[PDB]
Amino acid sequence: MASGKVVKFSYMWTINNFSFCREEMGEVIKSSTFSSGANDKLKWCLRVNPKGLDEESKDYLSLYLLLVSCPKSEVRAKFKFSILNAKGEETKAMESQRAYRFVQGKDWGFKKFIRRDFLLDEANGLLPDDKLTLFCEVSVVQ
Amino acid sequence: MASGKVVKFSYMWTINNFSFCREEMGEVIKSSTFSSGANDKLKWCLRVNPKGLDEESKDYLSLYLLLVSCPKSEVRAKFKFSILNAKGEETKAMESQRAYRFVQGKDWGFKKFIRRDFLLDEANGLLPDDKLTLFCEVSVVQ
Amino acid sequence: PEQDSAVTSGE
Amino acid sequence: EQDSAVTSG
Known part of the structure; x- marks a missing residue:
């Protein structure tokens, strides 16, 4: 009898050609699925809205963590979203x-994660070569 | 379009009946596999020698990280190992x-991770109910 | 106010 | 009590 599992993890997501993205307000980009937890059965993804979700968030990118699937009724997790700048930090x-x-099909996140004009201002280095690199660290409660 | 990857992960591993896990599975103990990388394609495990395998390490528990499956040529990673005491820290x-x-089949870690005399002494709080709980945090260089 | 810290679910 | 050095298998 020994058992183990991944209880905390960071997912790096890069969106290529962030400018030339076809999505407008209220339209979504889903990342691929990533796993954690007992038997690799917690299934997660990221959901971004590039030009905001709604009226309150029209000037922002919205960023969410989605629990796609899980075996029990819930997962309790902390999360953190960040951006990788061109200087590598x-x-x-x-x-x-x-x-x-979190329940299966439920997301949690930041409707107003960052202002599009900040992101698009090239003195902030957040879109080097027009690639947006996001980090999501997830820490699951045991 | 876009692509993503788990690049840092922490694996928690619990060995029940630590006092005679050598009796149950001999000199080496591999954990089950855990996954990272592009489409969950790097597969890793932990490798424990509850008693070290030479005269310098006989008084120690030895602890390693093993890369088990790798479609890639190689991977570079930093790691950290620690123990979960009964208090929870x-x-x-x-x-x-x-x-x-790392390449497929290669490991790295600490031949003298901790003294068996300290660990087995249950007043120290590291073996609640003869269960050892190990934590391995990994960060794969990009 | 380049970022806002309020957390919500998918709405 | 613990040694910091790193080796392969």
């Missing part, structure tokens, strides 16, 4: 400070 | 400070 980090309750 | 942490080069 993590910036603009925001965390959920406590754990959030 | 990390203790006894030791880190590779630099990255090491």
Whole structure:
């Protein structure tokens, strides 16, 4: 009897050609699925809205962590989203400070994660070669 | 279009009945496989020698990280190993400070991770109910 | 106010 | 009590 699992992990997502993206307000980009947890059965993805979700967030990129599937009724997890700048460092980090309750099909995240004009201003180095690199660190409650 | 990858992960591993896990599975103990990388394609495990395999390490538990499956040519990773005490805290942490080069079948870690005399002494809080709980954090260089 | 810290679910 | 050095298998 020994058992183990991945309880905390960071997913690096790069969106190529961020400018020439076809999505407008309220339209989504889903990342590929990534696994964690007992038996590799927690299935997660990221959901971004490049030009915001709604009226309150029209000037922003919206960023969410989605629990696609899980075996029990819930997963309690903390999360943190950040951006990889051109000098290779993590910036603009925001965390959920406590754990959030995830069910299969439920997401949690930041409707106003960052201003599009900040992101598009090339004195911030956040879009080198027009590639947007996002980081999501997820920490699952045991 | 876009692509993503788990690039850092922490694996928690629990060995039940530590006092005679040598009796149950002999000199080496491999964990189950855990996954990272492009479409969950790097597969790793932990490798424990509850008693070290030479005269310098006989008084120690030895602890390694093994790359089990790798479609790629190689991978460079930094790692850290620690113990989960019954109070719930990390203790006894030791880190590779630099990255090491892994290929399919290769491991790296600490031949003298901790003294068996300290660990087995249950007043120290590291073997609650004869269960050892190990934590391995990994960061793969990009 | 380049970032806002309020957390919400998918709405 | 613990040694910091790193080896392969």
